[PDB]
Nucleic acid binder design. Structure first.
Length: 78
DNA sequence: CTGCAGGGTTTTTGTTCCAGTCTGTAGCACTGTGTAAGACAGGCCAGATC
């Protein structure tokens, strides 16, 4: 399983999906790498759905921190 | 059937370099913990004594 090999190892696998995402970025967004993968993965995880990850996947990017936000780290240091 | 050599096969695993972008340690000049009375030699004076 690819989860056991190195990250360098994976070179051969995802060529076609990189081509597809580069072609898709042009016609609808213009270069938005984040969203096209985020809304795909967060929703595909909920295909066979346990909410244990739905919490982990929701706060991952925007709110808040992930990990603790930099301002919270600054306050807990000062 | 087996044995081993050596053919191809995919898939690591890493192969060269230049824009970068990010991370982690090096260089700078300097800190703070070292924290008290006692020994000794000389000058002298005051009270005792003949």
């Amino acid at each position: 399983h690819l989860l056991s090999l190195t990250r360098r190892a994976q070179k051969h696998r995802l060529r076609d999906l990189k081509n597809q995402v580069k072609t898709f970025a042009e016609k609808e967004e213009g270069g938005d790498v984040k969203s096209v993968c985020l809304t795909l993965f967060l929703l595909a995880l909920r295909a066979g759905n346990e909410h244990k990850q739905a919490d982990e996947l929701e706060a991952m990017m925007q709110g808040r921190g992930f990990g603790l936000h930099p301002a919270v780290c600054l306050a807990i240091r000062v």
